[PDB]
């Protein structure tokens, strides 16, 4: 019908996927055993987008959990919502890459590329009219950034027309936890530009920014961070699963967000974030929802859009509202902050309404936006990659894998020609 097969790669991928598969189970009212315990009829009306039917009133996620190290699976499989995954879909080898992008991509990722392509193929053909796959990984890893590209390059050949998302994670400059982070990210964005329909650049440091200042959580676990990201991936396909006054989908956003195929990097957003005591003094209304969103403090990216031009904007709203206000509020921001919006594209924003609110909450919204201020990230990563690469440092690890050295030069050049082309659209 319209089905999504959720990919997975690496320890970053497994911990976001564990939380993400937790939260949609709550919207659809699915208990840890797998059965259905919801009370509203429409909670089970389009579940087959993500779940697959099994006997006994049981549903299984359409996931492909992949990692070079089994150790991440064992932590996943012992969670509350860990036994809901079918065991055959787990794909895992014996040895990892050790934050080396080349080991993931060329030598060890080759042995696990046969089985993963089988697990998706069985799930790809199970669904009649598959809408498109979806992957989450980190660019600072060895498996998610590593072979995690080798799936993407392969399945584009098999299934070109289907839509590939990626809630990939981009390293942050101020705090980094991998020394060879520049080389993996430089060699992965070069994969991302050629083979991807749409990308969401989520940075963990901005998640630390949000939790510290807005929610003011004293002890933000990595579970809290994944909840921030899992809530985003629900809000992009909520129109797929539930009806609305003006409906949408993945392709409706992607078509209406990408003016030229080279630009598919978008800054997500999620509106109703308040502290424990802030909800006392708040007012659940649409102008406040749009006010809390466009503030740069709410973004989970590492770039302020006030420095660039908002190319295009998507806003998807959750909850039964009156769209006199949503059109008037969307025009108010468009006309006030005129300098930060591009000129050759009028009516830059796309809107959609999904009537069913998230569970326990009255109103919500999410946002996808393309800016020229993101290139403040690619430009920022490049010199970190370049300064390493003048001295040929950390290169014997990569060169010992059999790759030549011109891959670094071209991946630098694609990275530099992208920001050059991206820079031109700012000054147009």
């Amino acid at each position: 019908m319209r089905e999504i097969v959720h990919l997975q790669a690496g320890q970053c991928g497994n911990q976001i996927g564990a939380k993400f598969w937790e939260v949609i189970s709550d919207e659809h009212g699915i208990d840890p055993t797998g059965t259905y315990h919801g009370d509203s009829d429409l909670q089970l009306e389009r579940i087959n987008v993500y779940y697959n039917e099994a006997t006994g009133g049981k549903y299984v996620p359409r996931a492909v959990l992949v990692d070079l190290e089994p150790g991440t699976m064992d932590s996943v499989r012992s969670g509350p919502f860990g036994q809901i995954f079918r065991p055959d879909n787990f794909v895992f080898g014996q040895s990892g890459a050790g934050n080396n992008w080349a080991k993931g991509h060329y030598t060890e990722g080759a042995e696990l590329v046969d089985s993963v392509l089988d697990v998706v193929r069985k799930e790809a053909e199970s669904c009649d009219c598959l809408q498109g796959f979806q992957l989450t990984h980190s660019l600072g890893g060895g498996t998610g950034s590593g072979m995690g590209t080798l799936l993407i390059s392969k399945i584009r050949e098999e299934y070109p027309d289907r839509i590939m998302n990626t809630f990939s994670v981009v390293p942050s400059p101020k705090v980094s936890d991998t020394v060879v982070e520049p080389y993996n990210a430089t060699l992965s964005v070069h994969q991302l530009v050629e083979n991807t329909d749409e990308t969401y650049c989520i940075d963990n440091e901005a998640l630390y920014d949000i939790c510290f200042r807005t929610l003011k959580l004293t002890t933000p676990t990595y579970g809290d961070l994944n909840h921030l990201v899992s809530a985003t991936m629900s809000g992009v396909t909520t129109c797929l699963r539930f009806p609305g006054q003006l409906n949408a989908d993945l392709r409706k956003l992607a078509v209406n967000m990408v003016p030229f195929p080279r630009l598919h990097f978008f800054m997500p957003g999620f509106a109703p974030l308040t502290s424990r005591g802030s909800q006392q003094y708040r007012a659940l209304t649409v102008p406040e929802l749009t006010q809390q969103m466009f503030d740069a403090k709410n973004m989970m990216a590492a770039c302020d859009p006030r420095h660039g031009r908002y190319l295009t904007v998507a806003a998807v709203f959750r909850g039964r509202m009156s769209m006199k206000e949503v059109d008037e509020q969307m025009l108010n921001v468009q006309n006030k902050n005129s300098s930060y919006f591009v000129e050759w594209i009028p009516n830059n924003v796309k809107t959609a309404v999904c009537d069913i609110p998230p569970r326990g909450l009255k109103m919500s919204a999410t946002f996808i936006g393309n800016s020229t201020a993101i290139q403040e990230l690619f430009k920022r990563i490049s010199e970190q990659f370049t300064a390493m690469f003048r001295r040929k440092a950390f290169l014997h690890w990569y060169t010992g894998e059999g790759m030549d050295e011109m891959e670094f030069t071209e991946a630098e050049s694609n990275m530099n020609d992208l920001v050059s082309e991206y820079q031109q659209y700012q000054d147009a």
């Binding site: 190290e69 991440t72 040895s95 990892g96 080396n100 980094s176 020394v179 963990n204 390493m388 440092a393």
Partner: protein, 441 residues
């Protein structure tokens, strides 16, 4: 499954193995006999020990180690000790006569006798093994066995296992105090032949640990046991991510890769924090900022070199306990924003962060207090080139007169290999200088 097999060589290797395996048994829950203090066999339960211990058909666990020493008594103490039934008898291998502070004897005459037997034992242990992460090899550069036979074991292990990691914990010679006269000869002839055959190296001197244990733990009269407790704690924090879950786990290959920029240079310096007594920790609040600031103090390194006399090129960092990523990031920011700590030009981000949940256990009769959080560090810095320079100075002024070379030449090693090894270290120091130079115009 996770796996590290231990290849302790020498008297230092055997005593370090004693401390490490006592800590592993107490940490996992194994009795000194080997069986759990229960029956607990109605089903397959917690198997986290599988990276160190091996199950048997009797419900017993056997350690994945091979103690080797070329003299009998150090291993006979193990065979008669408290843990005398923990170890399978064929694992602990001994020899009739030792090299007696002679790399030549430990490399050519006596070392080559017990090469085949230890290699066969290693082959059986690896045969038992499914997912082999690495070989942990601990020895000293001074003693004859721990230099010569350990070097030859590495050299043949390269043939036997092409790609497996061979991690190297080393007792580096102390700059002033010493237990030997002929130790610089073994020190120069060891690194020269392990330079292309070893993957990483965790060299520590006993002197700096003596200063640490005096200054912090208030033990006015330390002992090798008191030092071996700290070394066991270091190895514990290294392999904790393999044994237990974490917010961000880290294998061996990860911190091998994010620590060594160039093929010849592989010599990190380790650091543990905090190491304080119970009285000292009664009054002192401990947090991520305090522990990561103490990790950078020159008066806390267990090598006698001040890194302010150099520049770091990498830092692997391993948090353990009730640590929080937000405070870790705050601490990383506050250490990056300091000029007293330099960094090389080519490395804007030189950090590799791992996180583990389980706080370090305490062994009875120890020195440390029970602490909720801790941190380990492996910093690859260029401030160790002064140590190599001092070593070359001592070797040079010994070698001018051909002193003690009559011992070495007879056993089957020519004198030209001495000059070749000295020239190799001469090249290595200049390599360190080229790395330490900055390209700023």
């Amino acid at each position: 499954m996770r796996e590290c097999i231990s290849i302790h060589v020498g008297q230092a290797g055997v005593q370090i193995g004693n401390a490490c395996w006592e800590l592993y048994c107490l940490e996992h829950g194994i009795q000194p006999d080997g069986q759990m203090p229960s029956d607990k066999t109605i089903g397959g339960g917690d198997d986290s020990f599988n990276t160190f211990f091996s199950e048997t058909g009797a419900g017993k666990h056997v350690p994945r180690a091979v103690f080797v020493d070329l003299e009998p008594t150090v291993v006979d103490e193990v065979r008669t000790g408290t843990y005398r039934q923990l170890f399978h008898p064929e694992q602990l291998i001994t020899g009739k006569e030792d090299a007696a502070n002679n790399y030549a004897r430990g490399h050519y005459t006596i070392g080559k006798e017990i090469v085949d037997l230890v290699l066969d034992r290693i082959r059986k242990l690896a045969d038992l093994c499914t997912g082999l992460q690495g070989f942990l090899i601990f020895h000293s550069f001074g003693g004859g066995t721990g230099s010569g036979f350990a070097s030859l074991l590495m050299e043949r292990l390269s043939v036997d296992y092409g790609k497996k990691s061979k991690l190297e914990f080393a007792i580096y010679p102390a700059p002033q105090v010493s237990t030997a006269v002929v130790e610089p000869y073994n020190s120069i002839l060891t690194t020269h032949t392990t330079l292309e055959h070893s993957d990483c190296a965790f060299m520590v001197d006993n002197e700096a640990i003596y200063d640490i244990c005096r200054r912090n733990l208030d033990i006015e009269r330390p002992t090798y046991t008191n030092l071996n407790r700290l070394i066991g704690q270091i190895v514990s924090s290294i392999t904790a991510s393999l044994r237990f879950d974490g917010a961000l786990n880290v294998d061996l290959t990860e911190f091998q890769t994010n620590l060594v920029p160039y093929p010849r240079i592989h010599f990190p310096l380790a650091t543990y924090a905090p190491v304080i007594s119970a009285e000292k920790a009664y009054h002192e609040q401990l947090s991520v900022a305090e522990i990561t600031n103490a990790c950078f103090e020159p008066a806390n390194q267990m090598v006698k070199c001040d890194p302010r006399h150099g520049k770091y090129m990498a830092c692997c960092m391993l948090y353990r306990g009730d640590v929080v990523p937000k405070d870790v990031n705050a601490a990383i920011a506050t250490i990056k924003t300091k000029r007293t700590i330099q960094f090389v030009d080519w490395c804007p981000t030189g950090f590799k962060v791992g996180i583990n949940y389980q706080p370090p256990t305490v062994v009875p009769g120890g020195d440390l207090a029970k602490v909720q959080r801790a941190v380990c560090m492996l910093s690859n810095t260029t401030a160790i080139a002064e140590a190599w320079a001092r070593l070359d100075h001592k070797f040079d002024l010994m070698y001018a007169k051909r002193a003690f070379v009559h011992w070495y030449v007879g056993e089957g090693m020519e004198e030209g290999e001495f000059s070749e090894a000295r020239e190799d270290l001469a090249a290595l120091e200049k390599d360190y200088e080229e790395v330490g130079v900055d390209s700023v115009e």
